[PDB]
Structure formats: C-alpha cells, structure tokens
C-alpha cells in the first residue's frame, strides 16, 4: 500500500493493488497480537482486527488534488466457507463489494468460478455508464443477474415438477443458464475479454429470450441493441 500510495498520488497514475490471502494476514496479526500478552478476541483473532484491517484496506480511493487512484482487490480465503467468520465479516464491513468464488462452480469445472448471485459491487453504478464502458452495461448486467437467478430457480424446480411442466420463461432460462455458465462465466485462464466484448457475449446470451421477455432492460436499450 505504500508503493501504491507513492505511485498513485506522488506520481500521477492509477494502481490496482491486489492483496492475496488476507486470511494469512489475519493469522499473522493473531501471531503478533498473542506474541504480546494480549488475550485473543472473538475467534482468536485480536479484538482490534477491525482497525488493523481498516488501516490496510482504506488506504485507497480517488483523491481531489491527484489524478491517480488506488483500487484494491483483496483476495481473501474464507475458512470453511463461512461468511460469518471474522475476516470475511470485517472485510465486508470495510470494503465496498464482495466477489465470491464458488466451490460448487469450481467442482463443476467453471473457470473462473465466480457465482454472480451472491457477488455484488456497491460502486458498480458509478463505473458502468455512458462515458465508461458501453451505455448498455447498467441494464445488461441487471438483466443478466435476474435471468441467472431465474435459471437457478428453474434448475431447482425441474427436479421436483418435471422438465416439461416448467413455464416457457423457465424453459428458456434453463438453456440460458447452461449457455451462460458454460460460455460466459467459463473463461480461459489466458483469455482476456474487453468489457465491450464481454457485453457483446452478454447480448448474444440475452438474445435467447424474446424481446418482450427482457423485463429489466430499458426499452431504448432494447431498441438500440438486440
């Protein structure tokens, strides 16, 4: 973060600080906090871990006088995949989003194994826009999330009420989920997709549904695209 602060404020350039294994960092904080005589806190991790992680995370963000900006993507290991663990809880409190890597998706073999149902970015609306990325991004992402949720519900529903009894929307949504997890989320380890190309693939996926079925998409966006 000191390298990032230098390069991004003293120098005028942007920085994407990526911090790996904040669970390992928390274990290190535990080791030092108990290297003194301090009593362990909520789960062994020190009671001040909120401050000790805020002082690391918060050293980022755009600044008025400087043209640079530090954006942090702290890679974080969830022990036992428990969100209520102290590290994920405090990182959720301090940071401004959550990207989830899914054990189920990874086992299915979907690289990269992001599940978009739990994952979100609070400051997406400040990034996706007319001047930043394509003007369709805001509606396309919302429609994609809604259709993915519908597809997950329909995949759950098929095993209990038969495939043929699903509605037309759910029947299309099953194929959308298959062609989505197998083509959109699925991505080669060395495959770089520009945001415009990713949106083009998103639209190619959304063309499965009829124009009247894309409820979340704005009518102007439907008219321009599709």
């Amino acid at each position: 973060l000191t390298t990032a602060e230098y390069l991004a404020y003293q120098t005028e350039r942007h920085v994407l600080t990526i911090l790996t294994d904040m669970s390992s960092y928390a274990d290190a904080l535990r080791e030092v906090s108990a290297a003194r005589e301090e009593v362990p806190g909520r789960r062994g991790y020190p009671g001040y871990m909120y401050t000790d992680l805020s002082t690391i995370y918060e050293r980022a963000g755009r600044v008025e006088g400087r043209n640079g900006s530090i954006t942090q993507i702290p890679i974080l290991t969830m022990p036992n995949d428990d969100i209520t663990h102290p590290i994920p809880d405090l990182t959720g409190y301090i940071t401004e989003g959550q990207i989830f890597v899914d054990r189920q998706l990874h086992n299915k073999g979907i690289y990269p194994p992001i599940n978009v149902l739990p994952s979100l970015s609070r400051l997406m609306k400040s990034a996706i826009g007319e001047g930043m990325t394509r003007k369709d991004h805001g509606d396309v992402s919302n429609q994609l999330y809604a259709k993915y949720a519908i597809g997950k519900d329909a995949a759950a529903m098929k095993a209990v009420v038969g495939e043929e009894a699903l509605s037309i929307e759910d029947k299309l949504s099953l194929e959308f989920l298959e062609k989505f997890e197998k083509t959109f989320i699925t991505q080669g380890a060395y495959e770089d997709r520009t945001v415009f190309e990713s949106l083009d693939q998103a639209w190619s996926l959304l063309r499965i549904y009829p124009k009247e079925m894309l409820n979340r998409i704005s009518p102007k966006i439907l008219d321009e695209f599709y």
Binding site: V160, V161, G162, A165
Partner: protein
Amino acid sequence: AKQKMGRVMQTAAFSLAEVSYATGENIGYQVQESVSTARFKVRARQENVSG
C-alpha cells in the same frame, strides 16, 4: 365433462328407448343374457403429469 355427460346420457337413453319401442320389447333380458364376456375394458396408464 359433467355437463357433457348430462347431455350424452339423455341422448343415449332416448336412442335406447326408441330402439326398444321399435323392437316392441325391452332388450334388458337379452343384454343380461349376453353378459358372459366383457367387450369394453379400461386399462390403467400411469401418465406422468407435473411431478
């Protein structure tokens, strides 16, 4: 189907009554005597509807 059955029973009973009037006697005895074998049978099918 209940309305349809209400119509069909009436029309079939009318047809049977007309046949009996034409024949001059009720065909009940002949029908009972001809009950040795069944010409109409229902085969159960376990059609999968919904779940």
